[PDB]
Write a protein that binds this ligand. Structure first.
Ligand code: HEM
Lengths: 498, 498, 498, 498
């Protein structure tokens, strides 16, 4: 026959032998007699306002759409589980990790970054890979990308970054001057620019790309003891990338390529997994790391910070409803359960704010009650009330102020954050000048071959070629800074294009 | 001790000996260590952005308020049951009335009409008495008033109506120029104004007033035979109104008088009931009733159209949470299940549209998924999908187009509406010169005594007095028009004020 | 250099020599000192909550996206003028057509129909061609399509229609089972499907397609004499469609092809025009036209109803800001100023309600105050007040009730609608067995050549092939029903695919 | 005649001799023929969906209401100006203050705190007194109360505070156990509890109460030099309070008493003013102040910190439209122009967040474009775009990322915040135990007479009397702590009530 993606209504149906379709209602639950024909006066007369069946149905239609995500708008989702396989309770007291063999339920959204909802899957762009964990200590979202780094070290530049990757305010086209003005103007961006215009540019679907946490977390054990960390969840299926030729065909042949695959995998029983490691850096090594340990354009070398196994991530269940389980899934960085905790990373620090800020806009004040966003494996008791589209019992008749004499929830000191020490001037510290090439240099010299560097160049100018020549000049100079061959390999190409 | 409203937290607690308070969490379900102290650098330093407990709880606060009801904003609610006590099966094939002794669950909100949410209960104003029934044919909402009539016969004059009962666009004050300007310029308004300024303008609480459907519905039996009707739900508690001096006192002394009283009755075992009655009008009697049978400023005389008993309405359960079961209740008149159906009543035809329309504004697109507004005694199966705050499973992976070869829901013929014939010009018919006094005149000579007649006169004039003399002059003509003594009993008094 | 879309920022700048950049502010207008570095304690400390510049700008970001159009989501817009060139005053008393040479301002958005916002321009889909006119009798919106007909005759089947053109509720993929399931089960759908899979299914850009009002309007002259009509706005640029091979290429190569092209034409002085024409049908010819004159799956033959010229539509100004003048444009069909008026067209009667309904959802309650949607060539005076984002002075302190003794606005009789007589049963008339093939048959024998006939066949089958065989079987019967060779030219090909 | 509040439509009218009311339109700007009569078929037929005049009007009605403020919901507003009268440029470099005789425009909202929109003006409760300044350096809102202190020192307790002052979640009544549980449980609250149950409990309208900034600001001069400050704006009309007897009559006689007065003042030309002083505390005095200088329950003694004149606040213009100019006014603490700047005050620090957070909910993402909320006297240029109900030109075609090579706005280093030094552990520092009585003690002994203390007691128990006796016990103990007579004067009363 055909791929399971395609046999969907077929199976929905096959599955009800215990048929006799339900009665077609209105949302008030009144049964409908005719839904193919509006109520008029005379077969050729006008539409009656008493066709409250028309308006019901129509009123709902006209309301189906919610704003799509500010970035990362286009994606795939799926459910499965995390299971412990080694223990790191030395490092962390978090339940999710509390005992080898332990299994917590998880949801996952894969996506691109710049493209809007009708875009094509198979495009050069970073790639979200977000995991929500319904632990007992509440949800723990770990909002990762498929890259360990990023383009910038200060959240304040984010809007601008994102703006320049999207569309001209006047034109509504993608604009290379904007792409290339930004980037060449902020060279802290060359590390990930270098990752992206590489073969890892475009993965072969979600199942053949790694996931990272990117940021530096803080892990705290049962004694109050702290260490910094890095999360890496590697593909059990391997890497596998799509040539740029392959990628263009699929953009038109199957703009939704990655939903299809993800779907079909799981469905045919071919469950993707990933192995979660952690890098660990003590506070003192932190004090000596030749770079700012909390700098998104930076990786921790694994000769120095070898990886430590933690458990697996198994993807084994397809959404029944895309809208309700994928369009509406809300991942908040700030959903850190006792034992995990953010570091001083500038980028992390504004994600603390931004996520729940746009969820309250896109989904609504109470988006945490949407089925899939509910810490269901835990017990929410607090003094927050009311708000639009308030679903549950609103916590009934329970005292709503704190503190009170009437047995309402009470805080639990064991969940205090880790005491830590800060001394400084409240000022705005430059970061544009931290080291912008070193790590880039090596990447280019020792992590990637010769074809790979011949390609990474071709792809770079192949896009760059359409900025104005100044932007070109600036850009290559920067590239030139990281390694002189990086630069004149690119300048030569640019020449022949130009 | 005290009355039960007052002992609430005291009972909420007495009720948990299996205490040991729950753990206080964020909305993500993550446990909190200190909810009395924000997170800072040093005890006199600034507030960290990292205090994602502060922003969780505050973020929820700053978002607790939804718009109040455009009208009837202030109210009380409660749950109970409707119980069939006579059969009207000849008249209607509706499930709710299917067999003597049947009980259907019902919710009810009482409310006043023009005050905004912190106003006083005990003001002269009409009173809302809505009844939502959860039937097997979905919900059936009977958005009645405690008056059998109203001020107007065209929904088109409603906005205006209410605009003038509210406050001034410039001042935010209540204005008698606006009240009396409108009412005097539209004397169809005499019928209900006479009802409004008599003893029943101020019910002693909610329990001592009648509920009226006011509009003329149409009943359809199992043979396709329709008849016109009017619903009356009379109080088993008796009429009882508070003197205007009594009301002044309590408006200041206890703004919530009515809420307190309903809570307390039911809390102590004194459950209000109302007997539901129907007047019936054949299609024949209707081609001959001397007035528009469908005119909301008219009643059907009880010697002509005797009241027939239908069942009883008992209230026997208070809300746990007011916000979630009384503020979020949405009654839509268009929620009529098979055997109940709207008449050509111009005021009713406008209500068909407005209730859901504002419900999608106030509450949200999918406000019918609010536990309390859910037709939970029926099963919802349709082609409506998606939309903000989509709570259900959103009907899974079931075909969302109609018709379809795949066993998704089907319309049911036994639910077609009742066939009626209309002939005429598509035009806008005046209804301003429909008879404005007859019924009024009678009302004032034979319905109200002499005490009352002096009383309705003082009350009226006591408010009329503050308009501009032009306005009185015209207010009084109108009055003079229903009965010369009505007119001049009032002038008598207005001269003495003026 | 390059095409003008591409030189935008370059020109935005060349355009300010009176430079010296403005001071960068918050939204409160407070000047910013560093917008590249957030505020922290020490250079590696945490982010202060005090960085109210971070939260200002990020808070705005996280809130940039409004819902996209439920349909016709992807588009292009532009401004220009409509110019009377013949008089039709006999037919219509509308101000817009009042006198030869009159120019009224107009806006226009082109769009496709089923793709979401990042889709490709050049797909086979119908094409939207909306025209908003700013007349002295307020706005008049002509929400046309580039097709004179459509797929259905009852708005009630619309949700379904579109649900099946979109993607699967479970998969998020496009499904041929859904496409062909519906279309085969509703053959009224043959008329437009035949139009859709022929050469004109893919216009070469926006400039080379015709605009059609599709529905039958009704024109009312200054004597009260009405007539039925249809609007045709033909391209002065000529027809021109891209081969399906050409389209594949560009869907990948330039998703925005159409936007780019419209921008560029107008940018370079090549201003598109379309000639507007009206077919007229007396009320008489309508009691005898052999079909429902008001049936959207039918055209009025041009030998019977010749096209009469009305004026010209020129586009001659591009947007400054796309979000604000193209994404926020709201066209409502019900915006018809005196002398234009809806017919009993069941599809049109449903559109009367849906456009404003979704506009209040997407944009907001008061979306008609959006500069671009404002009837700026008229003066708005009514009793509507308040509501979210109320921008105007909200009509000051002017009486907000009607009627009133205080000189607030008054209704104007010369604007009453046109009197028509309707007689019949309030019922729901089938329209499914209205004639589904005649016009179709002709269309395929005499309207389309032999090349085209082979072509519309391959195209059709090329997509049909992916449905379940049942579905083809039935798809093909239908086809067989309009012409035996239509039916079997297709089977011929489907057998060879299958 | 009557008070100007009352002659409002009268004057609106009087004012158009240049009458002939405007034409009554629809919002699209189409003229209306009949607005008193819906469109039906037959004078007694049903409502046509083509009455797009009905739905327009009605659609808007149903949308008029926006959520009211979370607190401070009920109030009055007015416009006028601030003028400099002494100079403090030693202290501050802020333009508003830049030169004696200087005048900046201002808006003001007076309000209560707990009561919802229909509440009564004349009630014991603190009183908002908020001033918005349209300076050249953007707006400067100074969100003050009519008290120099507050009930709490940590924002985290705010929701809970507010909750307990409102209504029981179950009951919806005001609950003294909740009021008195909170307060007695958190004694840091006795300073302001002492202010509130005093004669300053209920002012005689807005014009006879002082305004304070309450919080501690930071003032920075042109050299980078800093000092801490306190803003006091004293009534030029004097104090004047309403006995509690007076206050109850007015609650029913004229729930809107304070709007009326405020209105009438200004209208009759009786412009209220207030004199703005500043207290100043150097950083070293800060280091030695026997208390936490940044503690809301604390005042700076004026023998020690005598007041320094700054300018006047003159109120001389009434709103033309309440909704648009008072309901929609948004005051943000965070609207601090270069020269003014927040201190480490815990309460201030969460107001930085909360205000704009709930404005984006209640009014909308773009509430800064609402006429009255617009920094109109300044020039907004930034990189923020889009968002719902986006009014202006959206900044046209101007580069939207930063930094860029194309002359888009640039930041201005002279607006850097003041460098300052913080050293600490990131922890949550208790504050419940800071001194809770001292200042209270003196208040009670030396700021208020003997009648005043006899009253302050009577009012206290007069309310307290309705909590349970435990709450009573706790409470008086606390009162007892501040001074033993405070306590047994209250216990005696409580006795006689109980
Ligand atoms: C953590 C401490 C506080 C928090 C979080 C807080 C929060 C809020 C909120 C959410 C509103 C509603 C605003 C709107 O919808 O536009 C509000 C209004 C207001 N607050 Fe507070 N409040 C705090 C303490 C105080 C204090 C100490 C004062 C006086 C110094 C004050 C003065 C006001 C005033 C006057 C308003 C009314 C705004 C208006 O009149 O438009 N707050 N506050």
């Amino acid at each position: 026959n055909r791929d399971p993606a395609s046999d969907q209504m077929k199976h929905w149906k096959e599955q009800r032998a215990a048929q006799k379709p339900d009665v077609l209602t209105t949302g008030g639950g009144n049964p409908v007699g005719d839904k193919l024909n509006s109520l008029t006066v005379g077969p050729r007369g006008p539409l009656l306002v008493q066709d409250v069946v028309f308006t019901d149905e129509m009123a709902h239609f006209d309301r189906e759409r919610i704003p799509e995500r500010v970035v990362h708008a286009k994606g795939a989702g799926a459910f499965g589980y995390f299971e412990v396989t080694h223990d790191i309770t030395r490092y962390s007291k978090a339940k999710v990790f509390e005992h080898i063999g332990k299994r917590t339920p998880i949801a996952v959204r894969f996506s691109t970054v710049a493209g809007e909802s009708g875009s094509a899957d198979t495009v050069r762009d970073p790639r979200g890979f977000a995991v929500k964990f319904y632990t007992e200590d509440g949800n723990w979202d770990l909002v990762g990308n498929n890259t360990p780094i990023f383009f910038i070290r200060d959240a304040l530049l984010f809007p601008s970054f994102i703006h320049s990757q999207k569309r001209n305010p006047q034109t509504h086209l993608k604009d290379p001057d904007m792409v290339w003005d930004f980037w060449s103007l902020r060279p802290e961006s060359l590390h990930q620019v270098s990752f992206l215009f590489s073969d890892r540019g475009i993965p072969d679907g979600h199942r053949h790309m790694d996931g990272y946490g990117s940021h530096t977390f803080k892990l705290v054990n049962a004694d109050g003891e702290a260490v910094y960390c890095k999360f890496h969840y590697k593909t059990d299926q391997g890497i596998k990338n799509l040539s740029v030729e392959d990628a263009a065909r699929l953009a038109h042949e199957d703009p939704d390529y990655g939903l299809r695959d993800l779907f079909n995998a799981i469905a045919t029983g071919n469950y993707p997994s990933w192995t979660l490691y952690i890098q660990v850096m003590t506070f003192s090594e932190a004090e000596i790391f030749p770079f700012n340990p909390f700098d998104l354009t930076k990786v921790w070398p694994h000769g120095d910070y070898p990886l430590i196994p933690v458990g697996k991530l198994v993807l084994n269940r397809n959404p029944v409803n895309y809208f309700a389980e994928v369009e509406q899934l809300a991942f908040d960085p700030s959903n850190m359960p006792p034992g995990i905790e953010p570091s001083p990373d500038k980028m992390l620090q504004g994600r603390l704010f931004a996520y729940p800020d746009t969820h309250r806009h896109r989904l609504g004040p109470n988006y945490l009650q949407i089925p899939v966003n509910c810490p269901y494996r835990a017990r929410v008791a607090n003094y927050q009330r009311d708000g639009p589209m308030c679903m549950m019992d609103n916590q009934g008749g329970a005292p709503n102020y704190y503190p009170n004499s009437f047995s309402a929830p009470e805080h639990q000191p064991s969940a205090l954050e880790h005491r830590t020490h800060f001394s400084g001037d409240v000022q705005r510290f430059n970061s544009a000048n931290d080291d912008n090439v070193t790590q880039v240099r090596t990447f280019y010299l020792k992590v990637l071959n010769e074809e790979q560097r011949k390609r990474l160049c071709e792809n770079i100018a192949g896009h760059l070629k359409d900025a104005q020549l100044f932007i070109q000049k600036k850009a290559v100079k920067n590239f030139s800074d990281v390694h002189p061959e990086y630069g004149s390999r690119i300048q030569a190409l640019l020449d022949k294009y130009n």
